[PDB]
Symmetry: D2
Subunit: 115 residues, 4 copies
Amino acid sequence: CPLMVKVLDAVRGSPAINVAVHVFRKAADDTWEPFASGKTSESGELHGLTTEEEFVEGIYKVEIDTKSYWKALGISPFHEHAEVVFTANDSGPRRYTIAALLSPYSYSTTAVVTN
Amino acid sequence: CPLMVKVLDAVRGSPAINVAVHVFRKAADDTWEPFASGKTSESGELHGLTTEEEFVEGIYKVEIDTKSYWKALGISPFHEHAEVVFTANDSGPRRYTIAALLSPYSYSTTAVVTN
Amino acid sequence: CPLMVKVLDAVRGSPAINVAVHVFRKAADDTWEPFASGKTSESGELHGLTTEEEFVEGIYKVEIDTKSYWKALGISPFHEHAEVVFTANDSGPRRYTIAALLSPYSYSTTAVVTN
Amino acid sequence: CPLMVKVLDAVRGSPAINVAVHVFRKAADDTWEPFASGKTSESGELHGLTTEEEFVEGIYKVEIDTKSYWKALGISPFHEHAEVVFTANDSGPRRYTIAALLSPYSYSTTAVVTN
Ligand SMILES: Oc1cccc(-c2nnc(S)o2)c1
Ligand SMILES: Oc1cccc(-c2nnc(S)o2)c1
């Protein structure tokens, strides 16, 4: 599992469950092509997006569908989605966890890059 | 001044000065088109992006060019940029401040929305 | 105005108004003694806490009364308060803004420190 | 394990390793008495602070020694420590994870309360 996404809810103090997440890779013509996707588990985690073989160096966009999450809880949100855009590069045996902490009008995102 | 962006540096505890910021508005054809751009001042603020006339209802994306910012300080950061996507003026005209707090592997963003 | 506190509400996307804030300074005997207090304004800011004369070198604690804030909005939050502890003016006099962004189970705090 | 602490470093994008953490419980005379302590692991986690039997309802303070962490990396920090103060209350079968995301001039803390 070289790329994992973890989302927390800062209003309810809990994992953010069932948040849709879409990942794109930037293509040579500069458009974003679908790469992988899923919904966060009861733990607020999404595992199994990709494999070491298919996660080559390149520029990726991870879109976390925050707006639908807040709307399924009855809470008016600000953002359409949270977006995390980064270049993945080999520089040894790396695992990438993209963490996001959500509030209706605010989010933070951090990358934890290990091994 | 219906749209303002403010950026702070979480490493230095200071405003993030001279940060490039590009705003796009989603077009009829589902495309991001250029809306406005500028650079943060010595206070870390960017004023004068638009006017209440121009700033109609729409889906906007504010792209904050964080990787260029960190690179110019000798830091190789995780993200290419911070992107903030939101529907604006859909409940009538409002005033929007988009704040971002930056660290090399992390950022947060909040919107303060007032009448 | 060498010490200012600013508080935003991450649920509403607005300044956090009427938030009580108590500042203490560590005494000779290792005790926290009262230094200054106030409430945030309609802008979410608290000005006029101290003067450059009074605001000497020292270890300060800024206690932001977040639980009272959330309770008055009908939210039962996690934290009793947000506490921000720091050494001040130890490199000579500076200007300190202590910002906090609040959610019911989460907060962030940053200091912006200028000459 | 009803109380767990997890700390991330937002400048290096990694767990914050070997951060000292002290937990206090508020006593009837209103002073903080030592309750539990440890240092975060290679995963940035601290497990085994307490047991269900000894973690009764009450007010607790978790102090994360951020200043020493930044000083062992060569980075001038703002805060003396990060403090998380909260009331623990039974309301079913609860586990408390206190998460903190550190930058030199800024931190966030969230509580994830599960089961
Ligand atoms: O900790 C934060 C998070 C978001 C915005 C701010 C902030 N904005 N202006 C000031 S001053 O501080 C501080
Ligand atoms: O206080 C925060 C803010 C953003 C992310 C987190 C976090 N906690 N665990 C992970 S993984 O990420 C904690």
